[PDB]
């Protein structure tokens, strides 16, 4: 089959995403969105950071981890059936192509 994340209506969803700062003392921008990762950026952006902190936020969506140390995992509060679908987590790594793109499947029961 294929990896997926699961939650009942009402609960919080927990979607993982990670990087390891192989060049420490330096962070990269990140963004979550709805829909599979397109060629550039993420889909309907819901949460984004610059190279320092969150510069775009949506009600119900939160970075729950130490994102400055590579935990870019996402909490979604009080989920509904509408929240089912694919989410894109994206790390802006400097270089040609580079960008780490992660599609995470959420299934709401």
């Amino acid at each position, epitope marked *: 089959s294929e990896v997926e994340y699961r939650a009942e209506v009402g609960q*919080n969803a927990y979607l993982p995403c990670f990087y390891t700062p192989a060049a*420490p*003392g330096n*962070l990269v921008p990140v963004c979550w969105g709805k829909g599979a990762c397109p060629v550039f950026e993420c889909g309907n952006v819901v*949460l984004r950071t610059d190279e*320092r*902190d*969150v510069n*775009y*936020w949506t*009600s119900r*969506y*939160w*970075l*729950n*981890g*130490d994102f*400055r*140390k590579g935990d870019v995992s996402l*909490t979604i*509060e*009080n989920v509904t059936l509408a929240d089912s679908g694919i989410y894109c987590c994206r790390i802006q790594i400097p270089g040609i192509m580079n960008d780490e793109k992660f599609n995470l499947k959420l299934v709401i029961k």
Partner: antibody
Amino acid sequence: EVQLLESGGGLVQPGGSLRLSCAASGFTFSSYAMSWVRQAPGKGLEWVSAISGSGGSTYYADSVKGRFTISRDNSKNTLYLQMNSLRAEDTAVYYCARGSYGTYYGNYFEYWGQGTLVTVSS
Amino acid sequence: SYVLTQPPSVSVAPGKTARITCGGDNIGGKSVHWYQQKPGQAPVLVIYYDSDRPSGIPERFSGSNSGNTATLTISRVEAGDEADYYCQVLDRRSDHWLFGGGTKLTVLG
């Protein structure tokens, strides 16, 4: 400008209860995790309790579990701390604090209030 | 379980550089933040995420973090910089916000 004003501090006897309040302004209150931090006279800072933007999650230092309840009314831009079974060593200045935008926990104490003295004595 | 350690006191001559240690097990792995508290006043956020500087804080304030030591650095020390300085972390293992014991900065001469 961000503003955090504590009220409700004062005198109370060992075993007694008290309710602190923190009126917030100058930002969307619901969008930010809130904490309480305290400091006994001459002592260090000690984190007490925190609550998520929505109120969905609450967190407590061990030394106050079972006694203190943190809560919030987002339609009144107000944070609360219900303090029961108060003890001598709970005597301190109580500071309200706000965390950072888009973080579930808050992560750090970006903005502080001026605090409110709670004294627990017979 | 996770604990932060600071030296109680640090002295420095005016115009020099003050260094305030914050010790913890692989503290490099966690975001460290720094508070200034002048006698009688509420704490002020001086540095966040190791080395970021809040709007309106002088550039003489810098921070670092790697290994077992995080370090707040204050150059060209002036007398107003006397205070207690606390380091701070978020431990998502126990869901506690932790503080170091504090460091008294004293300006000599």
